[PDB]
Amino acid sequence: TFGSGEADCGLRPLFEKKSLEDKTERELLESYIDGR
């Protein structure tokens, strides 16, 4: 509500919360000059 959002925003029940990845998110992280 206030800036930034909700607090638990951006974490998906079926992916992040279960530590599961969707099939193309890797493509994004790889374009931020690789993230990890």
Binding site: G5, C9, L11, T24, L29, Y32
Partner: protein, 250 residues
Amino acid sequence: IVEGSDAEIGMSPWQVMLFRKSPQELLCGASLISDRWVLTAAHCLLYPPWDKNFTENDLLVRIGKHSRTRYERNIEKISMLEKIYIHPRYNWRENLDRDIALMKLKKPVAFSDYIHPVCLPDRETAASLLQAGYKGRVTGWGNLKETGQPSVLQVVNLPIVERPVCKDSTRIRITDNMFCAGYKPDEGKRGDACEGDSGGPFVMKSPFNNRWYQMGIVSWGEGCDRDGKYGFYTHVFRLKKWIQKVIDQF
């Protein structure tokens, strides 16, 4: 979305559908940013050249969808609007500058595995992720070709483009409140949003805290997936102060 694939179940739990009551139809995409606020593009609601000027009462927001035409009983939620706020300086007359609108829902929606809000970026996330070359993701139930509509939500991952390149691809005046994205003719990769996708989110996943942030709103483009052209999106962070203001004032 042109050259996108079907999204997975629960992939974009913040994707919203602005639905029209009569005729019943898909109007635009939108995003869930809190349990009571939806963000979309102002041209989805007000565009005088074509006499568009919708009010609360003409719209419905369908959250938690996957299928485009079916009422996903027990999975999606439908909310009504309480208020619509268009940016005071939205420029429909010349280039759709500040093409952003906020909608307050009648009642809070409850989250589920299919309904969850996206985060809005802070100065430092904007700064670190909005760099040419980095890919974002767009989702929507829009057309599949410029001139052909999908059964499920589609997704496409596109790179952000250097502003010089964006300005030199059109005769329209680009402001600092927009950014463009898409592949170059010279990238052997395609994709773009298309009609029916306006209002939806352009998101990035932070490699620092693994959260998804909504950096842009699908705003416009000249045709869909045309070579030499790119899609333009409203720059959410540059208008964030306007967002915070209506939300803590209303």
